[PDB]
Amino acid sequence: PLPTNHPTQDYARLIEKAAWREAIQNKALALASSRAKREEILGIKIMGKDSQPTMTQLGGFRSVLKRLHSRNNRDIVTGYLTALEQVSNRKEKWSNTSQGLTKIRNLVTQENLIWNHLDIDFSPLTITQNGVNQLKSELWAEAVRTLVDAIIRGHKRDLEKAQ
Amino acid sequence: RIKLDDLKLKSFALDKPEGIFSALLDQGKKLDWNQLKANVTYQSPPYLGISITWNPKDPVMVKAEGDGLAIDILPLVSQVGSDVRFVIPGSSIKGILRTQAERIIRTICQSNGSEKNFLEQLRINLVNELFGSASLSQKIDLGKIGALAVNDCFSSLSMTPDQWKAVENATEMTGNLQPALKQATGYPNNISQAYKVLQPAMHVAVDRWTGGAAEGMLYSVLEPIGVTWEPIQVHLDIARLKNYYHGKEEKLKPAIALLLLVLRDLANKKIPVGYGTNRGMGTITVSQITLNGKALPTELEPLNKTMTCPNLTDLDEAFRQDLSTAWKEWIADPIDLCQQ
Amino acid sequence: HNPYNFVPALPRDGITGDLGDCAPAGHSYYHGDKYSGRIAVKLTTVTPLLIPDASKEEINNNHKTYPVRIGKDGKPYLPPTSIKGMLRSAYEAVTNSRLAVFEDHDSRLAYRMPATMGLQMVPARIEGDNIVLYPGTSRIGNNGRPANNDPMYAAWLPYYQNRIAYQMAEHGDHVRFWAERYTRGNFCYWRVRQIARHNQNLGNRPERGRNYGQHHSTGVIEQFEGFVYKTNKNIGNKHDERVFIIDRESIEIPLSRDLRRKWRELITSYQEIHKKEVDRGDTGPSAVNGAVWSRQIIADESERNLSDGTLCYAHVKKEDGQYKILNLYPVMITRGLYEIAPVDLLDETLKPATDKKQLSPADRVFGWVNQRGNGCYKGQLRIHSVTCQHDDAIDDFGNQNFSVPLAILGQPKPEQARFYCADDRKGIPLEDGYDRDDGYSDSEQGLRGRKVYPHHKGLPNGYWSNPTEDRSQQAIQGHYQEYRRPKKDGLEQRDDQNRSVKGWVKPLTEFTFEIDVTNLSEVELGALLWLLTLPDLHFHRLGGGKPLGFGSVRLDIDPDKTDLRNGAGWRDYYGSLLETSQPDFTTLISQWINAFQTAVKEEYGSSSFDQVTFIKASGQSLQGFHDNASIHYPRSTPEPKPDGEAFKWFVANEKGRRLALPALEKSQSFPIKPS
RNA sequence: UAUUGACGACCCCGAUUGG
């Protein structure tokens, strides 16, 4: 690694972020490709003609998730889900998912869990001292947005095959 | 659209020693802009400005791209420098104008779109030249840029960014929403004035057997009933049309005639704007249309006018008769006029 | 008169022409054969109009107060959506379209047995996978009742008073016991005298028990063994529990999957309906004092499943000499399910539209969205430019701190089968006198259709005057002041069941709005203009409080401000920037109305338009009832007494003459005694 | 054979297109 005080460390930081961003986009799209993986991560699945939940319910959540610019914004997403969970009819819309409301809450709250799912060896994609922790804390908000967006989009394709 | 301010010219006489060293070390001779500006008349190219002065009659808004917590349907806002303002995007004004333009053309031709796909619905005469068409290479390119442009329109009201965030993040319509709206409307002291500007409202779907709300079908709108709006600027590139008609300035007349028909219907409230147009929103009054042609062809000079009659009778009858003749002549044989 | 009725929705199979389903006319151009333009409409109110602004509501003790909604000029603001939903529902009626808004209705509705039905329940168990019956020494009479005045099938265990202790036995206890035959009135029963757990010695025979009041001893004493089916103190005058006697004669039947689903579903009803009350920690049903929850509703899903050794009351009859079992029930007098879910009684052509081809007339005119998938259509109609014409239109009763309390706007309860169910899919009212079970019972049953709130014709002058006074105890000209919540102990009942309003838009106020219409056919336009030109004393219904009579409105046309033309007439208009004439559609308006009526006659096969059922019923709705009978919610007492125990009229009705809600066109008024 | 008494609020957005 570079010493943190090495003059070019600021320049290396630009390279690190660009390489991480593309790797995250790829690996999220890899996991979105599997109909088991969407069920593991969010609990969305296809059952006969239907999707659980309905696409509109994903679209609603997707519209909120774009407000997750920074980790402190986990308030907003947690605020949404608790407001969702309080309305019984809307809560049961997420029945027949795999625990989906809890899975989303975990992914939005547990700082580790996004990286555990994506499971990227960042070691070949980093060169700065402590770059891994600096970049994980940096990119967390974008990793979440990238993964959920990929899953919802990829799920829609498999719905069309079944529909 | 972009504008230049703070124009500074620095000069360096690099042919001579004082210049080259000034460039290396003394950062140039200052020059004033005003002297050189006086030396030339600004030679603006042929264009027509169209200024539409209007207000919401029923509430007007474009839907924000995500639902709130307290209020389900919110107006769209945009940043404008320091502040946020409500916005109607130009694309929405362009789209409703294109819709009425297309409807009029097809009506005259008794053409149909029920069987065409969406893309084939867009591609019809005169609107192709005014509003443009997608680039589509065909064994030749059918695509050309729309000669008509429209600006974003913003509310006369503005708010700080956090004030609007207080509305978006509100949770109780009887509760923390009411401070936020009193703040955001700028009447922290007086709820009634706030709600003469932004008024929340409830809606329900009634089950036809039982009456009362159908389960889950309860929803609410933040209706901007009192938000005042700036005049809409529509900007028509006469020069770009002249290229599409190969210089045959006479053949401008029917497209100009169509545009006046579009504006006539708009002023007659026939064109709603924004969200909810069938649900008690979007109907606008037009108080004034200002037409401002620069470097027009002389046969179009009577356009330089301000109109307050919705039927455009403030424009000269002889000029309207001329266009009406060229219009009827084109209706009788609605060729692809941009083909020479 | 009950304040609501239904216009019968007719099943639309084989409806052709424009009243039938069709591909939509579309927005892409004005058709030469169809009409477009702007209609000017004037609305004026007849009864006061409620327009509560929930955004300005206020709360005290969870009682709610609403001011009248006002617009940016300070006039009362009338939501055009509220006009739209008024007109659409009236349009859906007179066109008999698809019903645009239908909620869940897909589970079977629940109801309760009358107490008579308990006398034909038999104690029962499931053994492995067969139900078993334990009539014991009693024998099952033909109707299922215990035969020939023999004693009740189960023995009675004194449990909350004259306890027969061994600690008190519990629902799982297998037991041996002595019992004594006891008499009361019309019937007799085995009073338990002494008890032991099954393995223990019961001991010596007891003797001649006390006459516990009207429970008279006989000294006829017996020994039995079996199970105590103790539940809980689930009604205030429950003295006893019951115990099942395996010691004596028995019968069995294979457990059908039908009986499984009924039990599961019924126990699901019990456990879920009361969930909130249990979860906030109530000890018993709020509807009665002293009682505590029946055992099954507080139990786990282990009670919901029907596992080996579980116990039930079973409903059985002797049919062709065969004891056939119909249901399993946890309690002698039971909640039950009608056998059909209401959605399944509605004709598929009347259900909300499900594809782009089946769009019925109202769906085309007003637009539609598929609630189940892709599919939508922008309505051909816009209401706009709503204004109040008057300035002082708001009846502030005198000071802004006043607010009038306003009836009880209770939730509709379609469990009332004799009101909401139809004996045929043409909407025929059910027959009087039959039990509840007759309700949602055959697929050839129907639903009563589109609910309508008839006009409160014949109100007395000044009925709306001085509204804060509790005139409710005075039959002014024979009508009690019905909208006002009565006073209790001389004070206002600002309870959590009713809203209160700071005022209303005065009657005889006037409003304008315009209707924009596109590509209407001559039939669709004929229908719409007919609604806007109804003869006098016909009124539409608008806003809230419609059962109380609020929001009755007169609609009529301003013919000089209206402008309508066919597609060709617009080609002429768009063909020139110079001004041009308009056609005088006022010569055609009557013709389009006749075009509409003839379509109704032809497709619904009826000798005259005014005697099509939904047309007649709708007109009867908008004209209001006319026997000068008062309109109010059912109640046992002519005076609206403060407690408003409206339900006891329904219990009186149930034991009494069992009237059904009249056919709307028959204009029949309920008797105040339904005995 | 038909008696036992009187209370209680509800819905909170739904469906779809996402290039």
Residue B276: CA count within 13 A, CB half-sphere = 26
- Of C299, C274, C327, C323, residue with least CA distance to C113: C327
- Write down the experimental method used for this entry: cryo-EM
User: Which residue is closest to B317 within chain C, CA to CA?
Assistant: C578
Q: What is the identity of the amino acid at A47?
A: M
For an interface test with B, which of A57, A58, A63 has the most B Cβ atoms less than 10 Å from its Cβ?
Answer: A63
The b/e string for C383-395 (b: 16+ C-beta within 10 A; e otherwise) is bbbbebeeeebbb
CA–chain centroid gap for B251, Å, is 26
C-alpha distances in Å from residue B183, one per residue of A152, B165, B190: 38, 11, 10
- CB of B107 within 8 Å of a chain C CB? The answer is yes
User: Which residue is closest to C386 within chain B, CA to CA?
Assistant: B58
**Which residues on chain A are in Cβ contact (under 8 Å) with B171?**
83
- CB of C647 within 8 Å of a chain B CB? The answer is no
CB C91 within 8 A of CB C526: no
The partner residue sitting opposite B209, judged by closest CB among C414, C577, C578, is C414
Question: Helix, strand, coil: what percent of chain C each, to 5?
Answer: 20, 25, 55
Residues in contact with B170: Cβ distance below 8 Å, sequence separation at least 6, in sequence order: B68, B69, B70, B71, B176, B177, B180
Inter-helix orientation angle B253-267/B317-331, to 10°: 110
Return d(Cα B105, Cα B125) in angstroms, integer.
Answer: 8
CB C552 within 8 A of CB C539: yes
Residues in contact with C408: Cβ distance below 8 Å, sequence separation at least 6, in sequence order: C485, C497, C498, C644
C-alpha distances in Å from residue C426, one per residue of B157, C422, C601: 56, 8, 17
**Which residues on chain B are in Cβ contact (under 8 Å) with C80?**
58, 279-280
3-state secondary structure of C546: helix
CB C265 within 8 A of CB C278: no
Return d(Cα B257, Cα B272) in angstroms, integer.
Answer: 21
Return d(Cα C546, Cα C552) in angstroms, integer.
Answer: 8
Q: How far is C291 from chain B (nearest CA, A)?
A: 32
CA–chain centroid gap for C620, Å, is 21
C-alpha distances in Å from residue B300, one per residue of B46, B252, B259, B292, C416: 11, 9, 13, 11, 74
Binding-site residue ranges of B for Mg(2+): 72, 218
C1' of D9 to CA of A84 (Å): 23
- Of C28, C40, C83, residue with least CA distance to C518: C28
Q: Tokens 């420098």, residue?
A: B81
C1' of D3 to CA of C629 (Å): 33
Inter-helix orientation angle C80-95/C522-531, to 10°: 120
Alpha-carbon Rg for chain C in angstroms: 31
**Which residues on chain B are in Cβ contact (under 8 Å) with A67?**
66
The partner residue sitting opposite B311, judged by closest CB among C58, C89, C579, is C579
Nucleotide nearest A88, CA–C1', reads: D12
| Whether C412 and B324 lie within 8 Å, measured CB to CB | no
- CB of C376 within 8 Å of a chain B CB? The answer is no
For C398, counting Cβ atoms within 10 Å of its Cβ (0-12 exposed, 13-18 middle, 19+ buried), the class is exposed
Q: Give the strand pairing for C499-501 and C63-66.
A: parallel
DSSP A128: B
| Whether B107 and C29 lie within 8 Å, measured CB to CB | yes
The partner residue sitting opposite B278, judged by closest CB among C92, C379, C448, is C379
CB C331 within 8 A of CB C242: no
Return d(Cα C52, Cα C544) in angstroms, integer.
Answer: 8
**Which residues on chain B are in Cβ contact (under 8 Å) with C32?**
110
- Of C597, C603, C631, residue with least CA distance to C616: C597
Nucleotide nearest C648, CA–C1', reads: D6
| Whether B202 and C420 lie within 8 Å, measured CB to CB | no
Q: How far is B175 from chain A (nearest CA, A)?
A: 16
Q: What is the identity of the amino acid at C110?
A: A
C1' of D13 to CA of C64 (Å): 22
CB B244 within 8 A of CB B258: no
CB C634 within 8 A of CB C650: yes
Q: Tokens 């307050």, residue?
A: B308
Q: How far is C223 from chain B (nearest CA, A)?
A: 55
CB atoms within 10 A of CB B233: 18
Inter-helix orientation angle A100-109/A74-86, to 10°: 160
In chain A, what is the greatest distance between 2 CA atoms, to the nearest angstrom? Answer: 59
Return d(Cα C455, Cα C620) in angstroms, integer.
Answer: 9
Return d(Cα C624, Cα C229) in angstroms, integer.
Answer: 54
**Which residues on chain B are in Cβ contact (under 8 Å) with C89?**
206, 208
Residue C269: CA count within 13 A, CB half-sphere = 18
Residues in contact with C618: Cβ distance below 8 Å, sequence separation at least 6, in sequence order: C7, C90, C93, C94, C452
Return d(Cα C525, Cα C564) in angstroms, integer.
Answer: 10
Overall residue count recorded for chain A in this entry: 163
| Whether B67 and A89 lie within 8 Å, measured CB to CB | no
Name all contacts of C582-588 with Cβ < 8 Å and 24+ positions apart.
Answer: C585/C37, C586/C559
| Whether A89 and B171 lie within 8 Å, measured CB to CB | no
C1' of D9 to CA of C408 (Å): 9
Cis preceding linkage at C634, omega within 30: no
Rounded to 10 degrees, the C-alpha dihedral C498/C501/C506/C512 comes to: -90
C1' of D17 to CA of C211 (Å): 79
Neighbouring chains to B with at least 3 Cβ pairs closer than 8 Å: A, C
3-state secondary structure of A65: helix
CA–chain centroid gap for C415, Å, is 6
C-alpha distances in Å from residue C234, one per residue of A67, B173, C113, C119, C239: 52, 41, 16, 18, 10
Nucleic acid strand D: bases within 7 A of protein CB: 1-19
Alpha-carbon Rg for chain B in angstroms: 26
What are the φ and ψ backbone dihedral angles of C162, each rounded to 5 degrees? -80, 50
| Whether C412 and B312 lie within 8 Å, measured CB to CB | no
The partner residue sitting opposite B106, judged by closest CB among C28, C53, C420, is C28
The partner residue sitting opposite A63, judged by closest CB among B66, B69, B169, is B66
Neighbouring chains to A with at least 3 Cβ pairs closer than 8 Å: B
Resolution in A: 3.4
Name all contacts of C578-581 with Cβ < 8 Å and 24+ positions apart.
Answer: C578/B317, C578/B320, C578/B321, C578/B324, C579/B311, C579/B313
Q: Tokens 């079970």, residue?
A: C437
CB C652 within 8 A of CB C673: yes
| Whether B209 and C92 lie within 8 Å, measured CB to CB | no
Q: Tokens 């100009």, residue?
A: B256
Q: Tokens 């649900």, residue?
A: B279
